[PDB]
Amino acid sequence: MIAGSMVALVTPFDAQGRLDWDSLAKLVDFHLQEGTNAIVAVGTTGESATLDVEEHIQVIRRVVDQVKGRIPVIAGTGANSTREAVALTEAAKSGGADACLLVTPYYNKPTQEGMYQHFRHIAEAVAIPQILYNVPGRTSCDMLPETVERLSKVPNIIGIKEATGDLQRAKEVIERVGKDFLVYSGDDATAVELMLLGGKGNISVTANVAPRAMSDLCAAAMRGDAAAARAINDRLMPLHKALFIESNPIPVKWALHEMGLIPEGIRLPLTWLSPRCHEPLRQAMRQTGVL
Amino acid sequence: IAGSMVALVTPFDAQGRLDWDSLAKLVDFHLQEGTNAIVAVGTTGESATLDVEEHIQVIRRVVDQVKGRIPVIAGTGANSTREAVALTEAAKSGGADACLLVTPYYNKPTQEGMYQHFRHIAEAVAIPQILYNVPGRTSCDMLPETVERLSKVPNIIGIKEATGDLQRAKEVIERVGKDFLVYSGDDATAVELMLLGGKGNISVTANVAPRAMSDLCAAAMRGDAAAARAINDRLMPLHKALFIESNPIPVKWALHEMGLIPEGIRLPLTWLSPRCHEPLRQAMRQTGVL
Ligand SMILES: [Cl-]
Ligand SMILES: [Cl-]
């Protein structure tokens, strides 16, 4: 089921920037062992922007083939061209993905109607479940709740990753969509509150490094155990903050390399975490018991 | 590379196919009306929805028609350094005089990552390169300290500053060498950026008012503030209405109304909403374009 703690998985690169399949296999085994509910491969945390079409499908198949159906595998397949998004989404389907996550078009600032038409088009073009993703702090556009509600009535559009961290927005979306349309957090610091409001999962950067804790956090929030959920969240807060001290996924790749899970590669225009940021993150990782 | 530089639309037919005859009409319109350069396949040209093959073909077609009469600048930015290098290499082979490279959108690089991205591209491809800062689209802002660093890299010849912030414009102009040229990417304020020492405007409004834009840039660049401002003030209703919905949705409606292009635009962009037709039509009539 496409709910709970879903890791926004990094894509590990060796120091020359090439895909590191051995390291990817370690990460997939770690999630399998620690209670992660789903894996999101080749999204923003996975450096979607710097993977070419051939690499995008390679990663998806390698994750799908290793997971062997044990938990869902969701593929990032958004683009700011409708045509490209269709091609990425068809590739995910061919690759064996259970669902796709599609960011709102970045850069070109479509109207709300253009957002509707874009997602309506992709939903009809490719028969795979699709999850919308609203992150205005990256895309420079905001899919408003009225538009989310319209798309919630389309076949194959199963939910939304809402990344604004605006809990008034979360509540408005949750109120306006059917109970079958699931609202997931895209903001690790506030995800507990979004799930307590009725959301059904967290597509999480923190989960890369604290998957068991995040799995426990989502389960607690999702059953309404507010005290338990907030307790884990409050303990993780320094790590949620540190993991965005420079743009995600720079901090989390540093953290995963410190854990011995991945190599030091990251592709331009992203850079390895600045040394001025290493202390706050290392401290958070020790404090939460991750390292 | 200076003056009124049109941020040229890419015309499509009703089924979304490239309309080469319409493109040629537009290039002739600019040649006749005093436009000083053409920026092909940028933001106003729907770079996002052109595939690699289409991108280069548009550049090739514009270059070949222009025949050296005015500079042709190609939009070649990307949010992957690897992609940006390929676009830039392609434009150079295609005969572009320069390339315009947006700062990486969506993935929010650090300032150091911006430096390394642009310096890599400037080393990789021997074609003049113009930086492009537009935080309202990219969700990152290239700060003047980074602009200055890059202004020392060979091959990096200028910057299109689209923030509309004239204190930002002044800071950039003061920090960089007199050889590194600062161009406006905000039509409403471009006149002031040129009066501050900027050297052109990479303009949406020039698509529909090329003569007026050319006259405005020439006045601003020789320091005739009164004449530059009077032209700009005249055009202001059009500058505003051309962003009533995200550019290039309004300007494509305007160019179709003028009879210059067909009514095609590629998803996720949509044809101008009906409620926006009147204010734009009125602004075009007020300003003498229609
Ligand atoms: Cl971030
Ligand atoms: Cl706009």
Numbering used by the authors:
A (entry chain A): 1 to 291
B (entry chain B): 2 to 291
Question: Can you list sentences taken from the study reporting this PDB entry?
Answer:
Pseudomonas aeruginosa is an opportunistic pathogen that causes persistent infections in humans. Randomized transposon mutagenesis screens had indicated several genes from the diaminopimelate (DAP) biosynthetic pathway to lysine in P. aeruginosa as essential, suggesting the corresponding gene products as potential targets for new antibacterial drugs. Dihydrodipicolinate synthase (DapA) catalyzes the first committed step of the DAP pathway, the condensation of L-aspartate-semialdehyde and pyruvate to 4-hydroxy-2,3,4,5-tetrahydro-L,L-dipicolinic acid, which is non-enzymatically dehydrated to yield L-2,3-diydrodipicolinate. Tetrahydrodipicolinate N-succinyltransferase (DapD) catalyses the transfer of the succinyl moiety of succinyl-CoA to the α-amino group of tetrahydrodipicolinate, the first committed step in the succinylase branch of the DAP biosynthesis pathway present in most Gram-negative bacteria and mycobacteria.
The crystal structure of PaDapA was determined by X-ray crystallography to 1.6 Å resolution. In contrast to most DapA enzymes from Gram-negative bacteria PaDapA is not a homo-tetramer but exists as a homodimer in solution and in the crystal. Size exclusion chromatography suggested only one species with a MW of 60 kDa, i.e. a dimeric structure. This finding is also consistent with native polyacrylamid gel electrophoresis, which only showed one species present in solution. PaDapA is also a dimer in the crystalline state, where the buried surface areas at the dimer interface are 1500 Å2, whereas contacts to other subunits in the crystal lattice involve surfaces of 300–400 Å2. The basic fold of the subunit is an (β/α)8 barrel with a C-terminal extension of approximately 60 amino acid residues folded into an additional small α-helical domain. The reaction mechanism involves a covalent intermediate formed between the substrate pyruvate and an invariant lysine residue at the active site. The dapA gene is not essential for infection in mice, as shown by the ability of the P. aeruginosa ΔdapA mutant to grow in a mouse acute infection model. The reason for the ability of the PA1010 knockout mutant to grow in the lungs of infected animals remains unclear, but our data suggest that DapA is not a promising target for the design of novel antibacterials against P. aeruginosa.
